[PDB]
């Protein structure tokens, strides 16, 4: 009875059932986009552990989210040392208040990095476009790290704070609190617990995925510069990011891909071209990589599929056949987005709730008509 | 500081962020398979709340899971009264021990239906093929119900137990404990909290989805009979279930769909036919509807795509083009399956971990050659 029927603590449950929190802790092999030291941006077969990619992603999106707390933020700095097994993500703009929380009686940084279900994103009356929603991400990286360090400096509270966790968030010690006068920042430094992922080292494949995610951020997070291992990424907006995929590329007819672009408004940036590999989508919601898509992709793609069916009808086909020929790129800001998992690969919020619209122009639909999709359908 | 940075309890978090536990609590409109009072099995546009479908599904899969605790189980009885807003799922086979848990000091049924993170599925050394993994499902139905009743009778412990929860698992009272001599059963009776889903009533669309799920169970759960509203479902195994989709159907050439079947072994039952609507999959893992697919679908479909590429090559194409023409049906039993969410729509366990193989026969691949897929590709 006592061995059959068991209760678990929340902390036990995360280590026993990591998949619902961070994705699979087993290897996956699949074709995907990565940023390699030899070829840069390329689609190749990759072997990696999603859980390890995800704990990195949780800290990267948290940096991107600071651009919403402080629009004066200009910089995110990512560093990965496979030899030392140390990852750091640094951001400027406002730091975290270095002060005792009057309800929980702990330093605010210790509360929100060292206790589960803690967030500044729990009040949905504020209609934020942060990626953060659930109050898990940072603690999940902590739990899946042999060492996890939080360094934040907050001019307002005129202190700096540095606290270190170890052994899967099971050990800490007193925060170092100091006088601070200067330029706000937060720096998260962690050594991922590679034993949790049955890995010996951050190999080339995981480093290539984490590097690409740093490019995604440069493309997705408006007005923020990104450095990777001390070097500025040469991406200055979503259009330059999309170029990394399509600028140097030919259809299998030997004609350059025709890339169509519309910034419908501040919250919706769309590129479209021809796919010869079936439906492809590269999408971001609040700087989250929505790698399974969701309602934002369908909302944009249905408008295009609509207008392209018309054009084809009127020069001599079914939605799924048109979509088969679409490569779409979407950078969007959604108020209070919803997802079916902590991993946020699929965004489930209905379009009427987005807080904005993407009504693509007749100009955009005319250009879509010319980009080679119509011709393939006809052919 | 105290309003910006907040901590939530696990119970608060489930109501604040229901999407990661039960799926969207907002309406969704999409084409799907349902079982209607007028046409039976059919694909039509449906408007429903995934969260309400899911709390029903959690109790249905729990009944299916009892066939693993007691292989003598023969019967699941589902009843839905939209007028009274009462759903009941009854099963036979072994009941739940009616006895005080010696660690948690509560009746075992009160522990596992009234406290979060409680399960008989937390020991993965047992290599089970239950759908249950996380210790949430029943509590989530409880939390999303105005009234939730647990009735179980356990001959071994010679007692029956009946306890009622109300107001989102926030109220209960003493269990009724009685002498019991007879035939074991469990009956879960709940009134879903329709205000949580912005609904007035269990309408036709949600009832049609819940009804279809009762057909899925009759198809998926080997050696268990299913009744819906007091009437036995005329499905006696997976092949009869697949017939509900394809038996009375023509390709758009006016030729009957050719349906190929192999029971590779006790744990793998596969049907294949032609799709004219792009890739389609209907799959079950341990009686869970894996509506987003996962590694089990890819494992089966890659073998077929492989052998069909060969056949085409040798009578005058790319994987995605072959898959475009496949309608696959899969009923499988996977040891300790993993998923990216509590909703279990996508099964992420790698095939080397399944605990079994599905090596489809040359006989099956020859029949696949003849079922119209090759001809469409060629054409
Ligand atoms: N770089 C940062 N700068 C400022 N505040 C931060 C930073 N990283 C984390 N935070 C704060 O710490 C909180 C906890 O982060 P986290 O655990 O990732 O939760 P979240 O981002 O709110 N939600 P989620 O990521 O969906 O689980 C956030 O709500 C922020 O208030
Ligand atoms: N019909 C039933 N008959 C017998 N035992 C049951 C029944 N329904 C639930 N249980 C038991 O109650 C426990 C709690 O159910 P539940 O909360 O759904 O968790 P789970 O099925 O173990 N995991 P999950 O459904 O993934 O969250 C199960 O582990 C079973 O031991
Ligand atoms: Mg976060
Ligand atoms: Mg369950």
Author numbering:
A (entry chain A), B (entry chain A): 46 to 361, 367 to 429
From the paper:
Human topoisomerase II beta (TOP2B) modulates DNA topology using energy from ATP hydrolysis. The N-terminal half of the ATPase domain contains the ATP-binding site and is directly involved in clamp closure, undergoing dimerization upon ATP binding. The C-terminal half of the ATPase domain forms the transducer domain, which connects the ATPase domain to the enzyme core (Oestergaard et al., 2004). A heart-shaped dimer is formed with a central cavity that is 31 Å high and 23 Å wide, the dimensions of which cannot easily accommodate a DNA duplex.
The final TOP2B:AMPPNP model contains residues 46–429 and was refined to a Rwork factor of 19.2% and an Rfree of 23.2%. The adenine ring of AMPPNP is held in place through direct hydrogen bonding with the carbonyl of N136, and stabilization of the ribose sugar is achieved via hydrogen bonding to the hydroxyl group of S165. The key catalytic residue in TOP2B, E103, forms a hydrogen bond to one of the two water molecules coordinated to Mg2+, which activates the water to allow nucleophilic attack on the γ phosphate of ATP. Our data show that the ATPase domain of human TOP2B in complex with AMPPNP is in the restrained conformation with the nucleotide-binding site sequestered from solvent.
